[PDB]
A paper describes a structure:
Toll-like Receptor 3 (TLR3) is a pattern recognition receptor that initiates antiviral immune responses upon binding double-stranded RNA (dsRNA). The extracellular domain is responsible for ligand recognition and contains multiple leucine-rich repeats (LRRs) that form a horseshoe-like structure. Here, we use computational protein design to create novel miniproteins that bind to human TLR3 with nanomolar affinities. Cryo-EM structures of two minibinders in complex with TLR3 reveal that they bind the target as designed, although one partially unfolds due to steric competition with a nearby N-linked glycan.
Following a strategy previously established for structural characterization of TLR4/MD-2 complexes, we co-expressed the TLR3 ectodomain and each minibinder in HEK293F cells and co-purified the complexes using affinity chromatography followed by SEC. This improved occupancy, and after optimizing grid preparation and data collection to overcome a clear preferred orientation, we determined cryo-EM structures of minibinders 7.7 and 8.6 in complex with TLR3, each at 2.9 Å resolution. Minibinders 7.7 and 8.6 interacted with the concave surface of TLR3 in slightly different manners, with α1 and α2 of minibinder 7.7 binding to LRR15-LRRCT and α2 and α3 of minibinder 8.6 binding to LRR13-LRRCT. Hydrophobic residues on both minibinders (7.7: M3, Y6, L35, V36, and I39; 8.6: Y30, Y33, A34, V43, L47, and V51) form hydrophobic networks with I510, I534, I566, and I590 in Site A of TLR3 as intended. Conversely, minibinder 8.6 maintained a stable 3-helical bundle through core hydrophobic interactions. In contrast to minibinder 7.7, the electrostatic interactions mediated by Y33 and conserved residues (R29, Y30, K/R36, E42, E46) in minibinder 8 and its derivatives surround a hydrophobic core interaction network in the minibinder 8.6/TLR3 complex. Interestingly, our structural analysis revealed that the interaction of T38 with A35 and I44 stabilizes the loop connecting α2 and α3, facilitating the formation of hydrogen bonds between S40 and E42 of minibinder 8.6 and E639 and N667 of TLR3, respectively. Additionally, the R50D substitution in minibinder 8.6 enabled the formation of an ionic interaction with K589 of TLR3. These observations likely explain why the G38T and R50D substitutions significantly enhanced the binding affinity of minibinder 8.6 compared to 8.4. When the cryo-EM structures were superimposed on the AlphaFold2-predicted models of each complex, the Cα RMSDs between minibinders 7.7 and 8.6 and their predictions were 1.0 and 2.0 Å, respectively. For minibinder 8.6, the α2 and α3 helices were well-aligned (Cα RMSD: 1.6 Å), but α1 was slightly displaced from its predicted position (Cα RMSD: 2.7 Å).
Author numbering:
A (entry chain A): 27 to 335, 343 to 696
B (entry chain B): 1 to 56
Amino acid sequence: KCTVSHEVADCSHLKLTQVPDDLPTNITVLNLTHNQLRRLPAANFTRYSQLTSLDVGFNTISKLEPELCQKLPMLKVLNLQHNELSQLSDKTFAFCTNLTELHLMSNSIQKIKNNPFVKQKNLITLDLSHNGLSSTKLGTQVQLENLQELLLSNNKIQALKSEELDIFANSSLKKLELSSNQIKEFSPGCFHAIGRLFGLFLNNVQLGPSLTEKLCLELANTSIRNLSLSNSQLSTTSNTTFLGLKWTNLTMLDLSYNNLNVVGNDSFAWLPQLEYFFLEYNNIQHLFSHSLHGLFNVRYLNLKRSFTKLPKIDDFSFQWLKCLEHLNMEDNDIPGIKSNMFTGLINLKYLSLSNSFTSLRTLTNETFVSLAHSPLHILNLTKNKISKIESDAFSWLGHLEVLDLGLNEIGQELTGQEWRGLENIFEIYLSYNKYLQLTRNSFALVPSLQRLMLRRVALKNVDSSPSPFQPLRNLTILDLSNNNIANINDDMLEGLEKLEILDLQHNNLARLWKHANPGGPIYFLKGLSHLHILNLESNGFDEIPVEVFKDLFELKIIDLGLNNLNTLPASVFNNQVSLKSLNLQKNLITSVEKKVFGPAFRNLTELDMRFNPFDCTCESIAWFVNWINETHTNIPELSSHYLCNTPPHYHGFPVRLFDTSSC
Amino acid sequence: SLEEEAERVVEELVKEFNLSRTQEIALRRYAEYAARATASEEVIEELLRDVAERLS
Ligand SMILES: *[C@@H]1O[C@H](CO)[C@@H](O[C@@H]2O[C@H](CO)[C@@H](O)[C@H](O)[C@H]2NC(C)=O)[C@H](O)[C@H]1NC(C)=O
Ligand SMILES: *[C@@H]1O[C@H](CO)[C@@H](O[C@@H]2O[C@H](CO)[C@@H](O)[C@H](O)[C@H]2NC(C)=O)[C@H](O)[C@H]1NC(C)=O
Ligand SMILES: *[C@@H]1O[C@H](CO)[C@@H](O[C@@H]2O[C@H](CO)[C@@H](O)[C@H](O)[C@H]2NC(C)=O)[C@H](O)[C@H]1NC(C)=O
Ligand SMILES: *[C@@H]1O[C@H](CO)[C@@H](O[C@@H]2O[C@H](CO)[C@@H](O)[C@H](O)[C@H]2NC(C)=O)[C@H](O)[C@H]1NC(C)=O
Ligand SMILES: *[C@@H]1O[C@H](CO)[C@@H](O[C@@H]2O[C@H](CO)[C@@H](O)[C@H](O)[C@H]2NC(C)=O)[C@H](O)[C@H]1NC(C)=O
Ligand SMILES: *[C@@H]1O[C@H](CO)[C@@H](O)[C@H](O)[C@H]1NC(C)=O
Ligand SMILES: *[C@@H]1O[C@H](CO)[C@@H](O)[C@H](O)[C@H]1NC(C)=O
Ligand SMILES: *[C@@H]1O[C@H](CO)[C@@H](O)[C@H](O)[C@H]1NC(C)=O
Ligand SMILES: *[C@@H]1O[C@H](CO)[C@@H](O)[C@H](O)[C@H]1NC(C)=O
Ligand SMILES: *[C@@H]1O[C@H](CO)[C@@H](O)[C@H](O)[C@H]1NC(C)=O
């Protein structure tokens, strides 16, 4: 019948006309979420006298007899979603009160009639989302004594009155939602009738001027804490709007997606207690100094793409945001940083300036001046089209911990004078740059570095100097890919002991692991101890030195593929112990045996010896096919991956199907 | 596509080890490099667990 994991009859999509009637008598979640039923009588349900979470969503029930609840006193949550409970009755559920949550969405109930429900002593949450309701009269007397979070999500309500809410005399509401309903009247007295109306959602309704002005009056002397007017058309603002919200102590607000053009002088000055503040996705074109007056309690600010494509942040326009902690200036055309832009932000901790500027071609010393006194732990700075970092451009940043300078156009010859200061640098994301030639002293001013990402950065001066990476001693990651580095000295990676990743992918080192090169093959993976991952791939090493891998003992990934590599030497993996991966996709290996790949296959958990065409001989793959017999190694699928190709005598055969007994 | 679900793994760590936002970046970078290096699984979990143990 249906999948049954522990006590849930997950008859999700099993087109049924009747009830299951043959599942265990102790199921809890009869999740008939699409099964096209029409009736729920009090005969078939006596088998399920223990059902608790009945979900019959997305199904056509047109009638609910009261007797159905008589046989189900253990039900807690029921989701009558997308049903046809159109014609309601006084006793459609009279003594059916042991619920804890209820939904009646997409039922099209035009009228609530007189009093469908009066007891509901444990109805914490109730939803009536997409019915068609045009009022809020649910009962007559004190009622809903435990309804915490009502949801009138999408109705045709056109007003609000105190008498329509008198049934909420002593009802504690946490979050009340009246979104997506066009309202053009708020009759005097609506929310101080409700005992503890705490939250309120008015998203996506056009309130605007001449309506919000009296709305802030009505909410005055009402215990409302949260509020959200997202997409509620607010073209402008002044000092009279939200005046009445001074007495009622609000804590969170939302003006996102309402196309806010200009902010008035003393607007939002009547909000001493606004903690969060959301002005994202707006068309703001000018930000006066006085505009944010009174916002001394705003902690989180969101200005992702409010400053539409030129805006002019005036001088000292943020001096009143003393308690700001997280700025989000992300998708803007802000034209440069003036000398007094971020003045007063002595509580900032996260800046996130990426895709914000269109003029930061160069970073001079007098460019980050305004953040001299500001704490700043993160400085994103991606996609800012930086051409070249001049000297002492970060002298003002001492608390900075992440310098994520990727996705830029930084083409310059580094010298070391661009990092003066930066005593707390933990990350320098320099990926996706044009060209970065180095010197021996290019990193002597940052010995506190931890993650030097240098992918897709043509990196010169890697061999001529002693080592550009000698000063770095606390480096964990050294990413070098897409650079076409074609020469390395025996001291490129020297002294770096706690390095843990050595990514090297689109590199033409194929020439320097030959045998005919002058001086012998380059032994550059020398001395390292904590190299957990060594991703040497897509290079073309058709040879491996006998004892190149001596130092690597705690190595766990030796991903080495896309390499014309063939005929491995002996004792190549003699000393690697914790080798929990060994990837050789697309090589030229023709022979595998106990010295070539033996000691690697001991505690292995992944093997990728996929596309190398071994000679198909009883001696070429014998220990291999007697090793694939018992595989505690979580080998990938052995079908259509291992194939005989070389000898015409037995060409075209998977290794598992090779008759081992013949040899 | 399925390997993206491994983010929930570190998210569990985010709940399991209530550490700084800066350390979350370090965990994400280590996980991304390991996933781009490792083949399938059962080493990401062990490596990320060891990293989280050696990060707090
Ligand atoms: C609810 O019914 C299921 C279905 O029988 C029970 O699951 C079995 O329980 C017995 C003993 O409890 C085990 O030996 C079986 O292996 C279980 N699975 C089966 C038969 O597929 C479950 O225990 C019942 N739970 C309660 C609380 O009565
Ligand atoms: C909210 O309640 C306050 C009382 O704390 C109201 O303030 C009174 O306003 C009237 C005129 O509107 C004055 O005559 C009183 O002197 C005020 N009371 C004071 C100053 O303690 C306020 O009007 C109420 N908000 C409304 C009705 O929107
Ligand atoms: C809100 O801003 C308006 C400006 O639009 C202020 O109106 C001014 O008030 C001063 C002081 O009473 C008077 O010179 C005039 O009434 C207005 N002057 C101008 C140039 O408009 C108003 O005072 C501010 N405050 C309130 C509560 O409305
Ligand atoms: C930022 O860099 C500029 C460019 O070097 C500095 O301007 C120079 O300052 C010195 C010392 O006052 C003068 O002697 C020079 O004449 C200035 N111009 C040039 C072209 O060198 C400026 O002082 C630096 N700002 C800070 C705060 O150090
Ligand atoms: C700096 O900001 C950029 C842009 O938002 C961040 O790059 C995003 O990284 C997430 C990581 O999952 C991706 O899902 C997004 O697609 C990236 N953005 C874009 C536009 O591609 C970057 O991560 C930020 N820096 C730090 C250190 O978090
Ligand atoms: C019941 O089925 C719905 C339909 O997808 C699902 O969203 C819900 O999680 C299920 N409840 C369970 C499995 O407890
Ligand atoms: C109500 O339901 C709960 C759990 O579903 C149960 O513990 C309680 O005994 C029930 N009470 C009545 C009167 O049905
Ligand atoms: C306001 O909304 C936020 C976001 O969901 C929530 O965390 C907070 O608890 C809400 N305020 C109250 C008083 O419930
Ligand atoms: C003022 O804020 C406090 C903070 O909890 C609140 O208890 C009080 O009801 C508020 N005053 C109102 C809403 O008039
Ligand atoms: C007050 O705000 C208005 C906004 O239009 C601005 O024009 C005016 O200069 C401000 N007053 C100041 C800055 O003293």
